[PDB]
Design a protein around this ligand. Structure first.
Ligand SMILES: OC[C@H]1C[C@@H](Nc2ncnc3ccccc23)[C@H](O)[C@@H]1O
Lengths: 115, 380
């Protein structure tokens, strides 16, 4: 299509993506808090039997974070964007790639604990 | 809270529905999440017990301690063939308590076992609370539906689930009888009326033949497939897409569970779109190995991938007619129940078989059983 043809309809899709960016920022903060708790358990005074429980409670939280990221991908996957909505298509690709990089980080934690 | 009315509850294998007759019509009640049907799911966590939408929304996170399909266990012996076959499929433990099955879960750091009627009572409690949340009054009286093939033990175990939930189970009625009541087939003037209820919803397929004479419902025959539904239709779409991705990209996505899930979720939505449109499009960025998957499916291709499954639904129809000693021209009414009866090809096969006979489908299929149970509840 044409360039400099920004339409009011694309504003609607960009608003949907912006809300999803905000939700990803919130889930990301949870991931960072889980990382701080992970370091906390490792540098604390919990004996083997007690650290085991603490890491498994953390495992449940990591799983919740992975699921929340997966529900964001599913939501994004409901979008159908016309070829002309270039700005929306670029924002959708960047958000999915940002979520996939956070998922890779969750997997780094998830595989290293409670098993 | 003041005294509330009587409700109709369809206790389903994978989902439940509650209705109330008020101000001349049936209102199907939306749950806390705004959903008109609630998952028949109970989840046992480290700190709490979740029921409904909250239970299904954490199934991927806690598979071994999230119970569903309790209806497939309720009122059965452990050694029952159905229990033994079904168990391989479930991610949760099923133990033998002196001949009776029990679901074994981890709840608040402890290993605990529950009977199928206890699980269903928790689902019934949720259905009761949904109605109390909407009406703003206490709900005690309920009509609860059961499949027509349910024996004495399965029927009593369903009544016991009602009692444990604090409900006064006014009546237990057959699901095809509820569906017939929803359409007023007992109020039609003439001789005995032969009715076929075609129920394709929640992962089960049930065909029942009824005879209504002077208000007396008679179950002439029952047929069907215990494991057949929308999940199977979705699986055939997933296979189609996985094959398409191998052809276009020479890459197999089938061992990446997240890529498969994203595809499966999109397929279920596309399948729903194909019930009112002849085409559905799917856009999935970075599906697998950074590859974007932009594609589409026509209604015709969706029907081809499922041809054996859709055609297959008529065998139960043939079996039920033969057992009831009735020819297809002797059926006066055909009722559609369950969400998958919304598939245009399914309706076409059933209408063509019955030689152009119009189907009763105006009431949402997912809601027709709870709808008739709510009509019956108001009459009592
Ligand atoms: O919940 C049990 C079944 C029902 C099935 N629902 C549907 N299946 C097919 N077409 C539909 C059209 C509109 C609305 C719902 C539709 C849904 O996808 C699921 O597999």
């Amino acid at each position: 299509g044409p360039l400099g043809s920004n339409s009011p309809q694309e504003e609607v899709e960009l608003k949907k993506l912006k809300h999803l960016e905000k939700s990803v920022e919130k889930i990301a903060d949870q991931l960072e808090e889980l990382n701080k708790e992970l370091t906390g358990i490792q540098q604390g005074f919990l004996p083997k039997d007690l650290q085991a429980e603490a890491l498994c409670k953390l495992d449940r939280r990591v799983k919740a974070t992975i699921e929340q990221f997966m529900k964001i991908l599913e939501e994004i996957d409901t979008l159908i964007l016309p070829e002309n909505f270039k700005d929306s298509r670029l924002k959708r690709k960047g958000l999915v790639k940002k979520v996939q990089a956070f998922l890779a980080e969750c997997d780094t934690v998830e595989q290293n604990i409670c098993q | 809270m003041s005294k509330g009315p009587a409700v109709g509850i369809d206790l389903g294998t994978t989902y439940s529905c509650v209705g109330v007759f008020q101000h001349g019509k049936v209102e199907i009640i939306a749950n806390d999440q705004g959903n008109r049907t609630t998952p028949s799911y109970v989840a046992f966590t480290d700190t709490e017990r979740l029921i409904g939408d909250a239970a299904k929304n954490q199934v991927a996170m806690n598979p071994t301690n999230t119970v569903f399909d309790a209806k497939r266990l309720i009122g059965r012996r452990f050694d029952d063939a159905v229990v033994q076959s079904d168990m391989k499929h479930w991610p949760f433990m099923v133990v033998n308590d002196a001949g009776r099955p029990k679901v074994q879960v981890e709840y608040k750091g402890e290993t605990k076992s529950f009977y199928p009627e206890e699980v269903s009572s928790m689902v019934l409690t949720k259905m009761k609370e949904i109605a109390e949340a909407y009406l703003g009054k206490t709900v005690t009286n309920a009509v609860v539906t059961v499949p027509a093939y349910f024996n004495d033990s399965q029927r009593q175990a369903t009544k016991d689930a009602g009692t444990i939930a604090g409900l006064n189970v006014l009546r237990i009625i057959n699901e095809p009888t509820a569906a017939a009541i929803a359409y007023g087939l007992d109020k039609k003037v003439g001789a005995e009326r032969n009715v076929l209820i075609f129920d394709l919803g929640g992962g089960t397929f049930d065909v029942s033949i009824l005879t209504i004479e002077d208000g007396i419902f008679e179950v002439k025959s029952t047929a069907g497939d215990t494991h057949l539904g929308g999940e199977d239709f979705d699986n055939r779409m997933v296979n189609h897409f996985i094959a398409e991705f191998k052809r276009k990209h020479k890459k197999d996505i089938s061992e990446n569970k997240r890529a498969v899930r994203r595809l499966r979720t999109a397929c279920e939505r596309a399948k729903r779109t194909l019930s009112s449109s002849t085409q559905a499009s799917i856009e999935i960025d970075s599906l697998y190995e950074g590859i974007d998957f932009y594609t589409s499916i026509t209604r015709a291709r969706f029907e081809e991938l499922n041809a054996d499954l859709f055609r297959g639904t008529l065998d139960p129809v043939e079996k039920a007619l033969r057992d009831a000693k009735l020819d297809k021209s002797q059926i006066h009414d055909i009722v559609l129940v369950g969400g998958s009866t919304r598939i245009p090809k399914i309706q076409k096969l059933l209408q063509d078989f019955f030689n152009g006979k119009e189907l009763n489908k105006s009431i949402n299929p997912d809601e027709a059983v709870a709808y008739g149970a709510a009509v019956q509840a108001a009459i009592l």
